[PDB]
Amino acid sequence: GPVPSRARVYTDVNTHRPSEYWDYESHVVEWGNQDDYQLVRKLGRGKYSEVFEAINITNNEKVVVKILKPVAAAKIKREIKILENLRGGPNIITLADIVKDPVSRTPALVFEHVNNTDFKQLYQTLTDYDIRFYMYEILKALDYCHSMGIMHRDVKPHNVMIDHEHRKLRLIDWGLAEFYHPGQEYNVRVASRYFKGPELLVDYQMYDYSLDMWSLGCMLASMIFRKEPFFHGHDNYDQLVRIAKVLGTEDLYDYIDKYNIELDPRFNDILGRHSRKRWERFVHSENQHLVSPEALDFLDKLLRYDHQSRLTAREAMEHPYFYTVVK
Ligand SMILES: O=C(CCNCc1ccc(-c2ccccc2)c(Cl)c1)NCCC(=O)Nc1cccc(C(=O)O)c1
């Protein structure tokens, strides 16, 4: 069947560390006091949780409370363990407490307060410099979690908190994150449609940290080219065709042939034959101020079919695209 794959970096992290580190199911939660928190207002609702502005009445500090919706107990312990493992890491959201919500009877995670700059304002007014600055901040978070043997699996703007007034960034919502274990087959139903890596789209389960680097590439492409989303698929199948119309079909076939992956025969009628496009074709007078030869070269090294060939987060930090960023 398919040829196995392993990450080219951080394969050994979960071997070198003790079992309690990654064996999330064995972790015992020391529950905090739910009466310490007063909910102020709802901030958002997703498929797996509701997030609220809150006050920790014990220290009069603003906090964010994420109340989990009833789901498998394994998904809840996994997020808790990942958050505790990553706590203190650069640009990782800080988990401050874990309480039992009295109404839902589910865990409520308490985080450090965040103040999101309006999403439309960020998309529409971040400069070329600000894009590079914040991309570098995301890379610090990704190299940290990858170096800690964790893949985020849901990198997208909704999961990046930017307090522009304070040049502060946090990588949030670790609910889909997982521990990377070489040879482990993972669920391909992760990430939002437009951010899914070719590995997910061809049903290749032995993926790794490099999935996050593809999603980072999609987020960057959309920002610099002013095309939201960059790969605009109608469904999961058309999503791969949209990617093939840019990266070309020849390299897609080279990719699946390397891993002995067979495409779903549904693709025989819809994929066609497409040449690889030069990135300069997406440049126009309304996005030229966000594009540079360095930006294109960086994007070219993230958006590769072969998950083993993409820049890693640490290599990405060395790229000329970030030379202008004050470090
Ligand atoms: O929806 C959001 C985030 C919204 N992000 C907006 C945004 C993020 C990045 C970029 C960006 C793109 C390319 C390059 C550089 C930057 C842009 Cl243009 C916009 N926040 C509101 C909800 C919230 O704060 N949730 C939350 C808070 C704390 C913890 C958790 C959690 O699940 O752990 C959730």
Task: Establish whether 48 is an annotated binding residue.
Answer: yes
DSSP summary character for residue 95: E
Element (H, E) at 56: strand 49-56
Residue 161 Cβ inside 6 Å of ligand 1? The answer reads yes
C-beta neighbour count of 282 within 10 angstroms: 18
CB 123 less than 6 A from any atom of ligand 1 = yes
Pick the last residue of a domain from 113, 141, 158. 113
How far from the centroid of its chain's Cα atoms is residue 80's Cα?
17
Instruction: Provide the token pair at 152.
Output: 């985020």
Q: Does 95 share its domain with 9?
A: no
Using the 3D structure, point to which of 46, 79, 113 is the last residue of a domain.
Answer: 113
Domain span holding position 124: 5-22+114-327
Q: Is 75 helix (H, G, I), strand (E, B) or coil?
A: helix
Annotation marks residue 154 as catalytic: yes
The answer for residues whose C-beta is within 8 angstroms of residue 73's C-beta and 6 or more apart is none
Q: In Å, what is the CA distance from 106 to each residue of 58, 77, 102? A: 22, 12, 8
**Total number of domains in the chain:** 2
Resolution in A: 1.6
List 143, 154, 173, 212, catalytic entry: 154
Cα distance between residue 97 and residue 84, in whole Å: 10
Please tell me the experimental approach by which this structure was elucidated.
X-ray
Instruction: For ligand 1, pick from 80, 111, 119, 142 the residue to mutate: most ligand atoms within 8 Å of CB.
Output: 119
54 lines ligand 1 (CB under 6 A): no
- Ligand 1 site, residue 129, Cβ cutoff 6 A: no
Domain of 172, CATH number, reads 1.10.510.10
**Are 323 and 178 found together in one domain?**
yes
Q: What is the DSSP string of 18-46?
A: -HHHH-GGGPPP----GGGEEEEEEEEE-
Q: 199: how many CB neighbours lie within 10 A of its CB?
A: 24
Residue 126 Cα to ligand 1 middle (Å): 14
Chain breaks in the chain (C to N over 2.5 A) after: none
